[PDB]
């Protein structure tokens, strides 16, 4: 397992625009593709995202190019982020992976308000880290990916995924 199956597992791959669950336009492998209600803006942030007159669809290629992108896109993001960097640092590879699915999700930002969250993993306090994180709306919005994320920083093994 690594970061690229989990996320695919998280994400799922559709290569028809769809509507993510906050209801926002997005295609492939969770690629956001805008936050406004018009369909025509989204086609239009897809053709410049591919390079070409795609109609509202995709290949399997041209997702896996996003995903690729969107997923080194995050990991350059927490390296660049003061508050993100230093608890990636500290972090095993297991969990690492972790700390990245919720960028990738979520964004630099709103990851970043996870203050009390971060501070706690980074002090490896596990258990602590793990019922913290829960009281959010994340968690609230999307319990199964969240408990799975959660089971990852918790123990440190791919056990949610498997
Ligand atoms: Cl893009
Ligand atoms: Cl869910």
Redesign the pocket.
Known sequence: MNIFEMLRIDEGLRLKIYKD?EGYYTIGIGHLLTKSPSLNAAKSELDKAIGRNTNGVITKDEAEKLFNQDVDAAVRGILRNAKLKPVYDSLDAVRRAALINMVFQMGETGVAGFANSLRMLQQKRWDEAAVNLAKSRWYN???????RVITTFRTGTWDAYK
């Open positions: 669950t919005q999307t319990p199964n990916r969240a408990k």
